[PDB]
């Protein structure tokens, strides 16, 4: 399987998650969040060592609302986009929907409101791996490759401009 090897190559040094818990699940949700944070922070460390430190995320106290920034490099210029998502009640079987609100109405591969539209292969890939994938994997396998198509396209179309700073 090309798909299986491509997935492994992208995710193999990201800690796997274990607990089947969503936002309503009390002590099991607290445990799932420990898994989510341990997976995220290892992913960030790996990204720094790879000269690809491309996002920051924080959550509310309950871990049910996430927000932060991603960076994308094109022709050596660095573009920053605010990102956000809610954790669905049926997480982690259901994947969260990442939003890039500043691009609402600017990208065809996006829903009304700024939720990114991934290809059809992402949902069954998430489904086949439940509950091993978490937010680190959603970033690596969902947002990362989405940016790598859509941000070059929107820069070429003159939809995205780089602000002259510093």
Descriptive terms for the model:
166 residues; alpha+beta; Ubiquitin Conjugating Enzyme; three-stranded antiparallel beta sheet; 4 helices; globular; UFM1 conjugating enzyme activity; disease variant; isopeptide bond; Ubiquitin-fold modifier-conjugating enzyme 1
How would you describe this structure to a colleague?
With 166 residues, this protein is of the alpha+beta class. The protein has one domain (2-156): Roll (Ubiquitin Conjugating Enzyme), CATH 3.10.110.10. Helix content is 38%, strand content 15%. It has helices at residues 2-11, 26-49, 122-128, 135-156; strands at residues 55-59, 65-74, 77-86. The protein has a three-stranded antiparallel β-sheet, with helices on one face. The longest helix is centred in the first third of the chain and has 24 residues, at 26-49. The PDB classes it as ligase. Keywords: UFM1 conjugating enzyme1, UBC core domain containing protein, Brain development, Infantile encephalopathy, ligase. The assembly is monomeric.
């Amino acid at each position: 399987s090309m798909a299986d090897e491509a997935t492994r190559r992208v995710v193999s040094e990201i800690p796997v998650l274990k607990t089947n818990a969503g936002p309503r699940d009390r002590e099991l949700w607290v445990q799932r969040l420990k898994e989510e944070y341990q997976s995220l922070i290892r992913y960030v460390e790996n990204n720094k060592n790879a000269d690809n430190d491309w996002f920051r995320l924080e959550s509310n106290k309950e871990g049910t609302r996430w927000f932060g920034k991603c960076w994308y490099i094109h022709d050596l210029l660095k573009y920053e986009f605010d990102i956000e998502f809610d954790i669905p009640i049926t997480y982690p079987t259901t994947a969260p929907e990442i939003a890039v609100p500043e691009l609402d109405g600017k990208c065809a591969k996006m829903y009304r409101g700024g939720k990114i539209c991934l290809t059809d292969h992402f949902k069954p890939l998430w489904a086949r791996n439940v509950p091993k994938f978490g937010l680190a994997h959603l970033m690596a396998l969902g947002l990362g490759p989405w940016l790598a198509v859509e941000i070059p396209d929107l820069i070429q179309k003159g939809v995205i401009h780089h602000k002259e700073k510093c």
